[model samples]
Target: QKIHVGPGELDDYYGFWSGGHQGEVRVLGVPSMRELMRIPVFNVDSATGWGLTNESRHIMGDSAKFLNGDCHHPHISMTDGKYDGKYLFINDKANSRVARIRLDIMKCDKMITVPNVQAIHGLRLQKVPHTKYVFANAEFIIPHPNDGKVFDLQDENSYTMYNAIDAETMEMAFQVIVDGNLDNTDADYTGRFAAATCYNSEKAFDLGGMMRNERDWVVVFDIHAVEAAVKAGDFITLGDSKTPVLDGRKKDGKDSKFTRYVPVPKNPHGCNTSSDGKYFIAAGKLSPTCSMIAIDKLPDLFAGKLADPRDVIVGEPELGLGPLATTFDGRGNAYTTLFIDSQVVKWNMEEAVRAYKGEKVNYIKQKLDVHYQPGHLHASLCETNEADGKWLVALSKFSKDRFLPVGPLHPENDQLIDISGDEMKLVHDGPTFAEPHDCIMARRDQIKTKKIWDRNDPFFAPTVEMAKKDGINLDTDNKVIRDGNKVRVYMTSMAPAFGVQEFTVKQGDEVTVTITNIDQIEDVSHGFVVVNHGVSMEISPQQTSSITFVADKPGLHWYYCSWFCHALHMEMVGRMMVEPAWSHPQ
Candidate 1:
């Protein structure tokens, strides 16, 4: 079953000046179960309202005007910083430049006009591995001769890839352009339309659009050749005909280059690389599912060696609408968000691998019950400084009623309604959300001082030793027993500081866990829950909480505190593993 949450406050907005309906930014606070706080947009003056407040804005140093009217989707970036937080990156869709604003300062800072640029639509900061600089992908606005007026002809509506720009220097590095053209012109191509592109050392892949009008191709570019052309300035020219060294086209069976295409099921939008670079996943913007492509056997594909196409893992249909963005958790698992459906979906890589290997595997879906309607999910992982626990933070674009309601405009009686605490739980439904757009999980910041258990460590004995070293007592009044294929365990949490127990078990075993809080603190309480598998229970200060669930699959699972305590509650989280036993196979 899917979970939906209530209306959150509008946090930040990106507003522009040239077009009346252009750039506007709004910041919103996303509470667990309450009416979200809305931070107003800082307007520059009476004549030019900047949309965001001066104290909380990051200026994209570009001159482009934010798109208004028909194409209203303005690309935005947000930093994880809290107070003086610098969490937003906005593209001036009109001026063809980017701007930066310190969210805390609310004042526009460094702005730079991209050199030799027309109008940019798809603007993104691609973070490079082991570097402070981020490569930006700007979708140059395409020119159309409308009613006798000639627009910028140099701007090709295709996906144009750019090099990393030093945020400090604003100097551009590698500028590579991959061809993108819509294959099916009759498709529902509306609202900030742009293809998706991502790169690695070997090649850069551009997915989406109907080439010529038929085939759906994930075009792969030769990185070495493209980089050479960038250094020579021979490719990516405004009007020059210096052919690109690498054209991402596959030869056709009819002795001609394949052209013409159709939109892949979901409009393929975001692309991400696994930590080890062995795999890559592409999220379709219009389709309800995400696709995982394997690059590990690239040598075989290029060498004309036969390969199993099934190695490519495609996730189940997403309950949410358009999957706009996707990112891997580095453990072969991926998290994706639906822009329209307002749902977050997790894809287990281990299970996908098992399925690919022709083994029967049970698929488990972990849904984060928070609901922000019209979900355009942009998410990132977050962890605290002293805590090893990880949390996922998501950003919703618009309010629920703004898009989901039956009428054109909001009715007087349908304004803002407050639904706080347990009262909000009454409205939980599978498909009811307002307008949730994007989310980000700040994983890097969360890794600081957190102890992550190594995957290769021996299970039972090693885990116990680590707990003892951490000064946690396991030999208490509670008992731990291994009964045949089933494992039953019990633990207790004391007053002041809570106690968390971790364990490892064999897959397919039904494990029952019971947690009893011995001490009753005034307003504080203790609880236990297993995330990902969806078996969670809250325990009061002196109440005993028990939950029974099957270890149906083999993978890494996390158990953590649901209550918002101090750093201890966050740090008190633990992890477990369900692996295949040696008794089953050699």
Candidate 2:
């Protein structure tokens, strides 16, 4: 009941959480935490025609493409590295795929299944703070090329792989297969290039867990530079190729990799960036401090130009018990999620830098307690520097008394933190429909979200497969044309009423019923289900789709809109009557 909506008012921001095994992304409203929408990505979305439709299945990818599980991280499209509100991109660990979601329309337009073995939690690193092209890193190291054969890197170059993806096209442009090093990649933060941290190096061929914690690797890549080198066939790799021990790039000086790695402490997780692109933030799950490294110092190490990794680290503040993800306020502060302590530790980033230089400074500030164990947190431009960034969301792994219980597993708990002022406020607590590895928000400033499909509007165009074969303006084309065994019934749908009072057919007659959902309201979706007829379909506002079946029984069947659009749902009903089929046969 926290922050409920008032009549006639809409949500301020949209919250999309990744549904783990459900193979979908759940949408919610900030402040209100109201359930807004659900989008299926890798698996079946009967309600959205996501996977069930022929066009969507292939659009998502091949028959063997759906994931076993884990659509862990979701990133919205950025312009110059900040939220542009145009499209959303998400990564699935189970199948190693990326999906492009249209933000305004709330649907997945395309999904790409990557051929390379990378991305434990794979991160999208953009070159500028204003774009969607991402330089990605592998979160969990996959022993390349899906075979029982472990990195017998007899051809070592083949085993190391990272990629660059175009968010607009929802496609992978190139795979940067490094000639050295082996480790798991996790979480991404962007600036000029992208940076991620890795661990779990002790295990080989699915041999270790996060607890063993001996391995230490940090990686960064330049998506733009990769473009020049890859396209120009310039094969001069950078960084060491032999000494990383997790396949150790510890070698004397072989920058043969466009993607390079540095080492970090035991098991580093949630590597985020400050808004200025000055600090690359990282945390060791086993340790209790935050690591802030200077972005300028990276090129030297990335070029094998430095020996000590400390040259890049600007500050390490031991803020709390255990911290996972960290992000900054466009205002000069840092907010980090302390995992073990269940609190968000807000500290002064600039002060920590001064203290790191031996200045007496305030390292930590406020600590806001949330629900049980929390994983990832998102503040607008948390990954970039440009956003005004008002809201911060904490994705909790557990939700005990926060929501009603349907079973032992409750809905995910997401606590929204207000970052509009100097202090953070816990304004609302809502249920996330997924474990939610990560999420991003939408804004009206950067994008005109309303520029969407209207009644015959020219805004949205469907892919060739689902392109409207034919459409009836439910308002104008509400009529029936009956023929022999083929009885065509046209029914238009508007809120509160069916296009027609009723539809008539004869027993043994083959009937085709078209439901045209024509509403001017954006996201005004209508659900079509025939009572007791085993037929259900989701019709997007102002679009038309039809269902056909043989009338085997001679009786009346009820039809209603399954979704509660308004009080109008009750009146939004219709009927189909099958009259006797010349029963007194001649």
Candidate 3:
């Protein structure tokens, strides 16, 4: 079963429940017919502070901000867990705070605020045996000020710092600040802002920028020694051939180990480690590539006895872009959200392992087109196969409006595609989308009954015929003349217009078209062009124009108005069937 939720009206709550992809989210329990509950969230300006809690009984979601409010955007809820019996930790990006909500009580007991923090993007609860820590990444944006009198601006540097907080006390235990040289010598002196974080027994790894303008390299720090080194003003060198030393220390009082920053083939926007901590996968933001870094062999490389890191390329390239979030199944497979491309990229670790071992491998691919301008923030793999094997949801921040002509109206615009198993199929499509921000997929059994809706309604209307009353032969005599190996089409649009005009041409024929617009409407520029392999010409309201092109391909082609004329622009659309032969004597 899969579920989706969004707000209905301005304040009404709505939700949808469905069995796999066949059902829709609705308001009532009448199978597929009824109004659905709308989920409400606090919206501020264009941003919203949204959070969800996966409870045993039901899933709870709420937003702290409202649209067009004071704050720029609301904080986003990051993760929910069984910590202290089902607690939810959300990031309040605008407030620079983390809200800890007790689901059983529906109350927020702790609020950890970071001073001078602009955006707190990601949060994670690190639990090792009985000890637990809350890790977060803080980001700051330089502000440009304009006073109408003069422009007051300062080129301030951005830095990403890691803080470890005691889960029980919610107190800041230690802080490791990674700063760049203030002297402005190496590339951009500004520090790279950290966006994601993970840890292991040896050290803590942060992904963002190691140096300004540099995309590769993860900042490796010794969890136990980073705090002291920052206080001592010592620079943490990640990797060097001369003295291989890191900027942190192990809990056992040993110097932190270092691994040279090997560049991955893709730009990673989000990353995660395997559940068993054997592999590290990073997803790219602007390219169709994902990298898997092997961790088990790190000690060998640090000993100066191992092969060069450049000789190693781990895992297959999982193709997609703007992969904002990723997670792994308890098994070896990994799933990532390609926000901009509007698809979920599934990676098979078993296949990756085979490829790593120099064996023939078969990879899996799946695609889901569920959003318009889908900016998927996160996604997870489910434990059960009852719900489409995998469930993916998306966020569209911008909604489709009929009055707005900002771009093309096709569903392919700003869509998300999730490919699993090589075959590309449409999973979801719609035009009523807004700026979607994030998505999540969990096991069916793990999902509680909250709300669902039926989105199986027809997206496009079927063609219908209207009554026609006419006494005049209003059809235009459009002709396609072929001379030797060339072809030409001629037509005229006069006042009070005429019925449909038709023409035929053979494949591989070079064709020319001449159109004369005799309508008296001034400033009304009307023209027609064939889509998918046809030529178009622009003409003034009372002028004529000609266009020439080759009909090199044989298939059905569509023609429609390139300019907005009237509501008929929707009905003015026409299709032309281009067969192998224009005509034949049977």
The candidate maximizing TM-score is: 2
* Residue-by-residue lDDT tens digits, candidate 1, 392-502: 334344334534576553311111111221111223222222222232222223212112222232212333443345453443435455777766666776643445456
- Measured with C-alpha atoms, the lDDT of residue 220 in candidate 2 is 64
lDDT of 2 by residue, 1-586 (tens): 2355787877776776777766687777666667677887776755644554434555665743453546767776666655667776777767667777777667777777655455435555463545556445454444544466665434333345565666666566666554333232322334346666665544333435545544365666655566666567654332332111122232465544455655556567777767776777877666787777777787776666777656778888887777778777777788888889988888888888889889887878788998967888888656555656588888888788887777977877788888887778988786765577677665535445442255443222332122334443444677777777777776777887778768887788776666667777766777766777656667767665565567777789888887777777877888888788676242
* TM-score of model number 1: 0.46
Against the true structure, what is every candidate's RMSD? 24.2, 6.4, 23.5
Q: Which ten residues in a row have the lowest lDDT in candidate 2?
A: 241-250
lDDT value, residue 379 of candidate 3: 26
Whole-structure CA lDDT of model 3: 0.39
lDDT of 3 by residue, 1-586 (tens): 2123333412111112111111111122111112333222222111101121111001112223212111111111212221223333444444455545433232343556544344454455442332245555554422222124432222232333444455556556554443321000000001111123221111112343322242343333334344444456554322121111223222243324321343443344455545444555556555456656565554454454556553334674555656655555444556666667766556676686667667876554554544444443322332121113222334443444513465664222222233233443334333322322322333323323312111121100010000011111112335555575466555555432312355556676666554445455664555667776635544345333445566666777766556565556555555555556545322
Model 3 root-mean-square deviation: 23.5
Please identify model 3 stretches exceeding 4 Å from their true place. Answer: 1-85, 141-158, 179-214, 224-262, 265-267, 298-313, 316-318, 329-331, 353-364, 377-390, 396-436, 439-586
Clashes of 3: 60
TM-score of each: 0.46, 0.77, 0.45
